[PDB]
Protein: Metallo-beta-lactamase type 2
Organism: Klebsiella pneumoniae
Amino acid sequence: GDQRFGDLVFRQLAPNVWQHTSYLDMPGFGAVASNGLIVRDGGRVLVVDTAWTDDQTAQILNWIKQEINLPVALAVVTHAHQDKMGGMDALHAAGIATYANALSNQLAPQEGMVAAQHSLTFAANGWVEPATAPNFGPLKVFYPGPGHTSDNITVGIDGTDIAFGGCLIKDSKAKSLGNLGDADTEHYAASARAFGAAFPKASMIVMSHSAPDSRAAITHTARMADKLR
Ligand SMILES: O=C(Nc1nnn[nH]1)[C@H](Nc1ccccc1)c1ccccc1
Ligand SMILES: [Zn+2]
Ligand SMILES: [Zn+2]
């Protein structure tokens, strides 16, 4: 049930969860979809990832205002690339507190992104140190290890069957791992399986560049990454 709002698409995945989708169309390539998440947590909203641009991201906020009409308490962004952090200024202009992997905030200047206002750090088991993720509610943030990028993180939603792989995970029928220019080819496979292991009850796997899929997305992504070692 896709809901069109301006140039963006919103799809409800759970009573309190929506996928947001925005498009970037360059010459010599088809328009590229990028997906993030919107979560209503009681009387507030949480966002995972910006759209490609400030204008699109402001439209995400406008849709939230129209359909949910509750404050957006925070956003977490899942690595320092345009499809995940291209709209940071729109979030800050709206007064929304922003969070990213410390490494993402480190990379953001060079990558041409505005850094998030707060840095997450991670324990050795990969789970976010909770003292760096205040008031994340049902958002369970996990660093699976380097893969699509060295800084990519992932997000599960407590109370749902949903885990978000961002650009790390591709769908079960994908024909490649996408752009590998910033990838960690040696560690990608372990990182994909680490993501699955951290959210073992998740039956709906959401990702950046395909529609939601079964856990076969994890096994297939990892099996493709095995070929990079
Ligand atoms: O996001 C993407 N690819 C992806 N995501 N996850 N795995 N591959 C898109 N491809 C791409 C192209 C060149 C360099 C890096 C990525 C894209 C990103 C940014 C601007 C335009 C297009
Ligand atoms: Zn990326
Ligand atoms: Zn991507």
